[PDB]
Amino acid sequence: DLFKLTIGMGDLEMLSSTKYPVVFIILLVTYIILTFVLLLNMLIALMGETVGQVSKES
Amino acid sequence: FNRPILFDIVSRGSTADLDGLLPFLLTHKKRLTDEEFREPSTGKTCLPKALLNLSNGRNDTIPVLLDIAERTGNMREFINSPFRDIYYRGQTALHIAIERRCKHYVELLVAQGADVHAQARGRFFQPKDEGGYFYFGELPLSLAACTNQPHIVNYLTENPHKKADMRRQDSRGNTVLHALVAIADNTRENTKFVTKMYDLLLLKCARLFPDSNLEAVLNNDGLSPLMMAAKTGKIGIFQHIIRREVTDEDTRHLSRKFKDWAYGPVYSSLYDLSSLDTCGEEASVLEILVYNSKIENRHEMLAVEPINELLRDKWRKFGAVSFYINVVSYLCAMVIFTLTAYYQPLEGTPPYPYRTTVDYLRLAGEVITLFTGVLFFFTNIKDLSFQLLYFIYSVLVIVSAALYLAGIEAYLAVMVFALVLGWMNALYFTRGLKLTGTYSIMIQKILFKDLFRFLLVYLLFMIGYASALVSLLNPCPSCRDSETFSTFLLDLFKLTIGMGDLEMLSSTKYPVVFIILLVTYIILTFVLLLNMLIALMGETVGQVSKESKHIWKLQWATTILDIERSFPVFLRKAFRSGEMVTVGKSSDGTPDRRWCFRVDEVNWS
Amino acid sequence: GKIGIFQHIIRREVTDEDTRHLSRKFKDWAYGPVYSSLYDLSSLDTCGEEASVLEILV
Amino acid sequence: MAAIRKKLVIVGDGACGKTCLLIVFSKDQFPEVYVPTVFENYVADIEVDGKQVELALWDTAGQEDYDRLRPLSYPDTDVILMCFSIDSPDSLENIPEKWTPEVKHFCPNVPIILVGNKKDLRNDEHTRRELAKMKQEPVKPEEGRDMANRIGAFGYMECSAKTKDGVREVFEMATRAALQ
Ligand SMILES: Nc1nc2c(ncn2[C@@H]2O[C@H](COP(=O)(O)OP(=O)(O)O)[C@@H](O)[C@H]2O)c(=O)[nH]1
Numbered sequence: 001d002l003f004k005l006t007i008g009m010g011d012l013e014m015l016s017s018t019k020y021p022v023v024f025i026i027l028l029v030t031y032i033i034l035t036f037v038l039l040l041n042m043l044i045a046l047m048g049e050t051v052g053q054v055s056k057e058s
Numbered sequence: 059f060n061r062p063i064l065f066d067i068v069s070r071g072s073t074a075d076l077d078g079l080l081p082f083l084l085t086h087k088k089r090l091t092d093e094e095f096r097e098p099s100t101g102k103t104c105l106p107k108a109l110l111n112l113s114n115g116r117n118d119t120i121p122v123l124l125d126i127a128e129r130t131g132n133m134r135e136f137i138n139s140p141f142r143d144i145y146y147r148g149q150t151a152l153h154i155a156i157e158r159r160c161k162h163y164v165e166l167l168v169a170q171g172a173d174v175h176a177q178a179r180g181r182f183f184q185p186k187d188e189g190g191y192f193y194f195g196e197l198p199l200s201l202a203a204c205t206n207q208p209h210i211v212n213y214l215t216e217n218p219h220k221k222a223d224m225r226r227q228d229s230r231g232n233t234v235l236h237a238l239v240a241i242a243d244n245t246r247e248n249t250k251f252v253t254k255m256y257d258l259l260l261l262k263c264a265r266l267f268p269d270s271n272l273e274a275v276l277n278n279d280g281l282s283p284l285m286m287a288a289k290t291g292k293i294g295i296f297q298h299i300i301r302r303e304v305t306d307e308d309t310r311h312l313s314r315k316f317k318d319w320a321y322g323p324v325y326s327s328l329y330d331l332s333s334l335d336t337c338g339e340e341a342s343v344l345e346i347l348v349y350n351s352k353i354e355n356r357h358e359m360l361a362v363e364p365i366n367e368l369l370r371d372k373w374r375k376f377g378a379v380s381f382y383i384n385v386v387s388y389l390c391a392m393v394i395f396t397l398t399a400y401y402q403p404l405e406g407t408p409p410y411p412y413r414t415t416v417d418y419l420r421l422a423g424e425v426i427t428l429f430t431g432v433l434f435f436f437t438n439i440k441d442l443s444f445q446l447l448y449f450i451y452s453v454l455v456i457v458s459a460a461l462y463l464a465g466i467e468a469y470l471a472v473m474v475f476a477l478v479l480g481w482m483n484a485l486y487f488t489r490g491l492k493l494t495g496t497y498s499i500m501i502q503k504i505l506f507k508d509l510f511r512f513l514l515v516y517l518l519f520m521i522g523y524a525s526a527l528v529s530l531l532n533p534c535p536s537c538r539d540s541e542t543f544s545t546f547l548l549d550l551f552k553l554t555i556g557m558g559d560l561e562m563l564s565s566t567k568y569p570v571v572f573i574i575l576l577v578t579y580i581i582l583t584f585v586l587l588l589n590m591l592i593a594l595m596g597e598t599v600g601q602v603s604k605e606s607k608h609i610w611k612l613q614w615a616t617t618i619l620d621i622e623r624s625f626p627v628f629l630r631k632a633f634r635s636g637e638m639v640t641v642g643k644s645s646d647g648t649p650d651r652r653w654c655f656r657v658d659e660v661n662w663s
Numbered sequence: 664g665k666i667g668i669f670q671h672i673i674r675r676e677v678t679d680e681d682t683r684h685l686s687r688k689f690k691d692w693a694y695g696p697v698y699s700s701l702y703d704l705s706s707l708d709t710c711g712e713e714a715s716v717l718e719i720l721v
Numbered sequence: 722m723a724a725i726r727k728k729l730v731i732v733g734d735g736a737c738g739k740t741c742l743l744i745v746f747s748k749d750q751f752p753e754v755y756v757p758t759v760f761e762n763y764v765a766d767i768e769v770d771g772k773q774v775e776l777a778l779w780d781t782a783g784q785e786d787y788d789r790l791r792p793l794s795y796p797d798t799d800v801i802l803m804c805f806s807i808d809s810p811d812s813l814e815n816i817p818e819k820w821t822p823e824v825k826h827f828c829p830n831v832p833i834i835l836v837g838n839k840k841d842l843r844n845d846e847h848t849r850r851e852l853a854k855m856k857q858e859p860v861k862p863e864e865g866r867d868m869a870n871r872i873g874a875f876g877y878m879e880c881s882a883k884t885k886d887g888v889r890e891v892f893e894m895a896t897r898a899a900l901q
């Protein structure tokens with residue numbers, strides 16, 4: 001369910017189970033933003049090599 | 059006769075006019091050091107004015123002034139009158155005679171009895187960071203040393219009258235050797251006399267005082283000249299000190315790089331590991347170099363052969379084994395914590411029965427994670443790139459344990475948050491890997507702190523705005539009651555993400571203002587997220603090609619030093635690098651047993 | 664927004680002793696690089712009696 | 722080894738034995754006729770606990786321009802020797818009112834010592850008669866400790882520059898406090 005949620009909208013049914021939905025919201029949003037930052041880093045690596053390492057290596 | 063005309067007489071160097079000053083002073087009981095002969099703001103007496111208006115390097119009015127001063131009996135106060143202005147406070151007439159490169163006048167004042175240990179405490183005599191221009195060590199000998207005046211230094215240290223000892227320290231504790239490290243740049247012309255004068259003064263202090271090492275007098279900050287060079291980013295003097303060789307037999311115990319054997323081109327050199335590897339006994343130059351040094355020349359100094367080979371040997375001896383042991387231990391501890399939280403029954407209010415064997419396993423795992431947390435507190439309070447995140451994790455787990463003992467169910471949430479931080483912290487172990495290195499270096503800690511600030515602002519905004527909206531709701535879907543706020547917060551978050559439904563608008567009495575407020579709220583939330591992403595990309599691209607190409611050495615050095623600091627001091631000494639070798643006889647005649655590291659090199663010239 | 668004449672008027676110093684009332688940048692003392700100058704504050708920190716060059720400038 | 726330098730500042734009322742105390746400590750000879758208003762630009766070598774300390778004796782006066790340039794002596798000080806004559810009490814009652822504040826404003830967190838100079842006059846008949854003419858008595862040692870209690874100073878010792886009694890232990894205490 002979490003893989004489905006992180007790949008696409010999932011209606012957030014799990015907050016029905018939780019006693020405290022606010023902490024669940026905070027965890028979800030921080031996980032999404034951390035995943036976005038990690039994606040941005042592991043893809044800016046290639047972009048940085050493309051704009052930084054073609055000076056004499058290409 | 060008068061200050062305005064007298065200051066003109068000394069500037070013009072007219073000895074024929076100063077003839078009547080002495081009878082005037084005798085008949086009026088006046089001395090050249092009274093405020094009638096001193097500039098009020100700068101306290102500059104006659105002699106400092108006489109020391110800048112020099113023609114052909116000589117000013118004949120100065121001997122006349124000194125002769126008048128000795129007759130008045132104020133020679134000591136005239137020769138040592140300090141400036142009082144905040145920008146030049148403490149500057150006596152000796153500093154002016156040393157800055158002007160006038161050895162003859164330096165001799166004259168030192169013979170007459172000038173204060174050879176006068177500290178210039180002015181704002182211009184402060185480090186550049188503290189808002190100054192020329193920091194030379196505040197002493198007359200330090201000024202000459204930093205001005206590249208070997209003859210004046212020799213004269214000051216070998217006066218028949220009064221010699222300035224090289225062991226003296228200024229207000230900040232910087233000795234003459236420290237002042238040569240704060241005035242040393244990285245240019246080739248500057249480092250060819252800073253090192254030369256450094257060695258000159260070191261040998262001079264070695265012969266004068268055989269039982270004292272001038273490179274061992276720490277300043278007020280606890281830094282020797284080597285550690286100061288490492289911290290302040292001075293590569294040339296740092297290399298000279300770490301590779302120092304002296305040939306004179308009397309003072310050959312000051313060397314640090316002892317040649318051991320040679321075969322044509324190849325030769326083995328034993329470098330001395332003094333302050334480079336203290337095993338935690340005192341500050342170590344390596345630790346200041348990796349952490350405290352904020353200069354861009356950190357990688358150059360880490361590339362110095364003794365340091366680089368020492369780090370490589372530390373990695374070879376126990377670095378990889380202990381690193382993998384730490385990785386396995388953390389991973390297993392986190393898995394245990396995840397299991398114990400999961401299997402926790404949470405039947406009604408805390409605490410819960412541990413009668414069952416599975417319950418006993420939960421209790422044991424909780425004890426294990428509590429021990430890990432309290433260990434992290436012990437380390438942190440002993441201290442008092444992931445220290446802060448290991449601390450916050452431990453504070454969170456202890457707060458959860460305190461809530462669980464109190465009987466508050468809320469513990470799960472706090473305890474869950476701690477576990478999340480534990481998984482994020484594991485990335486420190488992944489710092490070395492090239493793929494996720496750039497993320498583990500600075501993102502996970504600095505970006506998490508800025509992110510915590512950002513979602514703190516976001517949560518306060520969202521909560522206050524939810525209260526503002528529910529103020530508008532129809533009291534009696536989302537009708538106003540006791541539990542309105544939480545469900546309304548859920549709905550608001552759902553609309554922010556995109557999975558929300560406009561069932562909110564059906565309840566409200568005034569649709570138009572509700573729509574206006576919601577559209578504005580989407581605007582501001584989008585602005586917050588956009589600014590968050592802007593900061594993210596900005597301090598992501600802050601890392602550049604030169605950075606990402608140089609960081610790895612520094613990060614591996616951080617990994618190895620942390621692993622080596624994690625050990626107890628006896629374990630630190632057990633895995634020491636290098637071996638004791640009889641380098642040679644000391645000043646007292648006893649052999650010097652120094653821990654030395656063997657580095658093999660070639661010279662083809 | 665004439666920077667040159669504004670700058671000159673701000674630090675106008677008249678060496679002549681017959682008419683020194685015109686000067687604004689008096690020199691209390693000056694040893695070496697440091698110059699301690701009394702800058703006249705007339706029409707700058709007006710305090711509401713007169714229009715302030717600060718108010719117009721900002 | 723290296724001799725550390727401590728900055729000592731001696732403040733007090735007019736004619737309370739400040740410059741005389743400094744001269745007695747430094748040159749070992751009580752001035753006979755020409756006592757200077759201020760004894761300036763002198764460093765004195767003292768040994769405390771087998772450590773060499775060079776005391777940069779700074780003198781302050783209350784006459785003419787000296788009142789104006791007394792504030793400039795305070796910066797970078799290490800110990801403050803506030804002075805009051807044992808014979809003259811008016812300094813004693815003035816010490817808390819003016820001297821304690823002036824020193825505190827320019828010298829925070831700096832050791833403070835108040836010293837009873839001209840101690841020899843305590844038993845002097847002429848000075849006792851002069852005080853009785855103004856309905857006054859010489860400062861008692863208990864009064865000195867009571868004054869030190871108000872300020873909270875490091876200590877209170879009496880000095881007699883003319884007799885060269887107490888002129889050494891006071892500076893030893895001052896440099897010991899400065900070494901802290
Ligand atoms: N009886 C006595 N007289 C003193 C003593 N110290 C100083 N005097 C006299 O007091 C006078 C004033 O002292 P002085 O040092 O000039 O005062 P200051 O300039 O305010 O310190 C001097 O002329 C001394 O002769 C002392 O210990 N005992």
Ligand SMILES: [Mg+2]
Nearest residue numbers: 740758759782
């Ligand atoms: Mg005096």
